């Protein structure tokens, strides 16, 4: 077994014809990032390697990091790579009838050599770049995203039900990096209040509550972080008007989980697109979510849950966006604590609460 250079062009190109077979134009190969610890490649072949011509290859250096650090890490990147290679195995009964829902293909993950290999996508343009730009995404294209994503997402959690106890699916109940993150992520809700002068007692126990669910619950399988800036939107190389496909890109947080908390992180996010952006293109993509999940789902929504998922994603969210002014963003998070005692109380008038059934009516 020979030793790799994979920080430098000639000793990435040894490693894939060498290692792998693989057929390298010695002139299709640019580096993407580097630091330290982290390099990505991105790779053109003369001759397909399961199916693909373009590829991506990452690598951690090791002895760059502590030992702690850089076995996290490695944990991270096997829970993603595997994740991908749980939809790619269940694609039929996922990605739908005529569905356009779609993961990056992974393609090797060599643990040896730190070595992964994924499918090139391509140079496009997340949701969040599309729903910024100035105009906005056309509506009918809003509409179709959300009625597809909201299919995808009500067939995963529909699966996760039904197979939680094959041993493929219960891997990612031991997720624990992954669910530590979203404790991680939860104890920013009383800082965030805080820092804009809301200060409510109540948020101690709302916090409690979030964190006990992610560490324990076993509800179904959460694909953990589904926003806008994870999503990319392939669009017809010419006409701006035909939507391909959708890629849903990073898996890493993928795990067992209360089914709340992805209709937490998109409805949240479409909440920030409507007061901040554009009111038609986030509502219309919300509703259309909501109409195809509530027809999908083989169980019923829980409305208080989602109020709260939703309320955590303004609260943590408002902020970091980083949009409209200071002066706005507090008003914002403000609804967002309100909407907790709309949550607790089972109030149905409840501003969030109250559309939430609307839009997800039946007839
Ligand atoms: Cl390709
Ligand atoms: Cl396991
Ligand atoms: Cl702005």
Known sequence: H????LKTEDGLI???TKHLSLDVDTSGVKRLSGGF??????????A????????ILKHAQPHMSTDEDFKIGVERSVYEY??????MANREVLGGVDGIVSVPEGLNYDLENNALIMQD?????????????????????????????????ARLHNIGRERRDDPEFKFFSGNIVGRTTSDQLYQTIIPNAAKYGVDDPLLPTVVKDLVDDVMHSEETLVMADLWSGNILLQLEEGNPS???????????LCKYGPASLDLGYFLGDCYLISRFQDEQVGTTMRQAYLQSYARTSKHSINYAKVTAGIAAHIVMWTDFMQWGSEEERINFVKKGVAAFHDARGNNDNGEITSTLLKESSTA
Do not use: C
């Open 2 to 5: 020979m030793a790799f250079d």
């Open 14 to 16: 040894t490693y894939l």
């Open 37 to 46: 610890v982290n390099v990505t490649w991105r790779i053109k072949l003369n």
């Open 48 to 55: 397909p390697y399961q199916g693909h011509t373009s590829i």
């Open 82 to 87: 595997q994740a991908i290679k749980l939809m």
């Open 121 to 153: 996508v391509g140079k496009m343009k997340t949701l969040l770049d599309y729903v910024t730009a100035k105009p906005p995404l056309a509506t009918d294209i809003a509409r179709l995203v959300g009625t597809e994503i909201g299919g995808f997402v």
């Open 242 to 252: 035909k939507l391909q496909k959708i890629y849903i890109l990073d898996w890493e």
